């Protein structure tokens, strides 16, 4: 991190949320953080289902834990239809993680948990996201974050669970939280583009290989540009043939001199050959 820092200047942008708010559609207020969390879970749930619905995948369903299941064992033809992209799954798993965290606060609010257990739980959640969600199946990269969290677990427990020291309690979660907060920051826009593109489609539906072919195209155009357009097409086809023949002749060491040709044309083709040869 220290060795390859970045440094940005962005005069240009004023916030998504500051901009988003302006105009008729949006409104602002206050709310219980938990309540908001609950809303978010439902929103995501609905939106993913909408996507699925639009795609016609009526034999799949999401449960309230964001697990995608089959309603009927499907045929391989239907399985091919079902093959759903990684980006979608990254969103889904992301939501799953979020849901999990929210739910523990809900249960604490119910008073069924314990403030200490709660802290231990959310700590645990962050540490073990690779097991609880399995998101890594759709980005393998995220392992870096997972491994980091694991390492943090090891260090912190050595520091307070080596006195007194066996099971849970714990409840410190700052470090691991930070890791995931940064991770998300780095992925948001990828998902935004994928989703955005998807939705607009819902409403819409040198090198050797490259160079030689471009070369011809450029040359033919200009020559086809000058053609008096009483005779353009006929005049052209034989225009193509000379380039092919002159390039054959270059290969074979035959000179390629021709009877009646205007000097200007004869220049261009030689220039082309010199370029192609190189």
């Amino acid at each position: 991190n220290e060795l390859h820092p970045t440094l940005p200047t962005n005069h240009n942008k004023t916030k998504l949320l500051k901009s988003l708010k302006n105009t008729k559609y949006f409104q602002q207020t206050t709310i219980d953080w938990v309540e908001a969390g609950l809303q978010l879970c439902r929103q995501g749930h609905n939106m993913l289902n909408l996507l699925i619905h639009r795609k016609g995948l009526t034999y799949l369903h999401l449960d309230y834990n964001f697990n995608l299941k089959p309603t009927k064992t499907l045929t391989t033809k239907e399985r091919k239809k079902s093959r759903l992209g990684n980006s979608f799954h990254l969103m889904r798993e992301l939501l799953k993680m979020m849901k999990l965290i929210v739910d523990t606060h809900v249960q604490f609010r119910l008073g069924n948990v314990d403030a200490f257990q709660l802290a231990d739980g959310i700590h645990y959640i962050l540490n073990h996201i690779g097991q609880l969600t399995g998101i890594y199946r759709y980005k393998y990269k995220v392992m870096h974050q997972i491994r980091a969290c694991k390492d943090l677990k090891h260090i912190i427990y050595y520091k307070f669970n080596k006195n007194l020291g066996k099971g849970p309690g714990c409840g410190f979660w700052q470090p691991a939280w930070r890791v995931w907060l940064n991770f998300l920051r780095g992925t948001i826009p990828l998902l935004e583009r994928y989703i955005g593109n998807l939705i607009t489609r819902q409403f819409e539906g040198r090198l050797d290989a490259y160079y030689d072919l471009e070369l011809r195209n450029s040359v033919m155009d200009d020559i086809l540009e000058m053609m008096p357009e009483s005779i353009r097409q006929k005049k052209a086809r034989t225009i193509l043939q000379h380039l092919s023949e002159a390039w054959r002749c270059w290969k074979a060491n035959i000179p390629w001199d021709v009877p009646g040709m205007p000097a200007p044309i004869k220049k261009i083709i030689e220039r082309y050959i010199k370029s192609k040869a190189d």
Binding site: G205, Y210, E214, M220, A236, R237
Partner: protein, 139 residues
């Protein structure tokens, strides 16, 4: 490229598919500027003469006629789509989409085999054929 003709309306596409009873109708769907839609436009043009007796070729541009984008679902620079007696033909190149063609084929020869295979299998009403060379790895 100027060898092979172009189709300037979706109504030129449809009549062209119908009126050719005895031969394949091969179409490249894609747009002039593309890197990969220029390359195929070559490998076909060279082949079009050799094959004139069983296959007919045309060129179409997604931007010129966008009417056909949703029905056949066209994505990426270009798609090669084969038609015989109004019946959309279909082949498995080992690539995991049996409809149309995507990738750029490499040799002139391996391209002529595929056309020839499709025609021969097609003549018998068979809806699937197998490309002898399966470029799943390639694309």
């Amino acid at each position: 490229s100027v060898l092979l003709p172009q189709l300037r309306t979706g109504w030129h596409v449809d009549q062209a598919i119908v009126t050719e009873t005895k031969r394949l109708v091969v179409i490249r769907f894609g747009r002039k500027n593309d890197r990969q839609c220029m390359i195929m436009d070559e490998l076909l043009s060279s082949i079009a003469e050799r094959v004139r007796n069983f296959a007919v070729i045309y060129l179409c541009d997604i931007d010129e006629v966008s009417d056909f984008d949703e029905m056949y679902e066209l994505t990426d620079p270009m798609t090669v789509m084969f038609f015989y007696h109004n019946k959309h033909m279909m082949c498995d190149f080992g690539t995991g989409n049996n409809n149309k063609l995507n990738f750029i084929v490499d040799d002139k020869q391996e391209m002529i085999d595929i056309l020839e295979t499709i025609f021969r299998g097609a003549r018998k009403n068979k809806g699937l054929v197998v490309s002898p060379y399966d470029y799943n790895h390639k694309r």
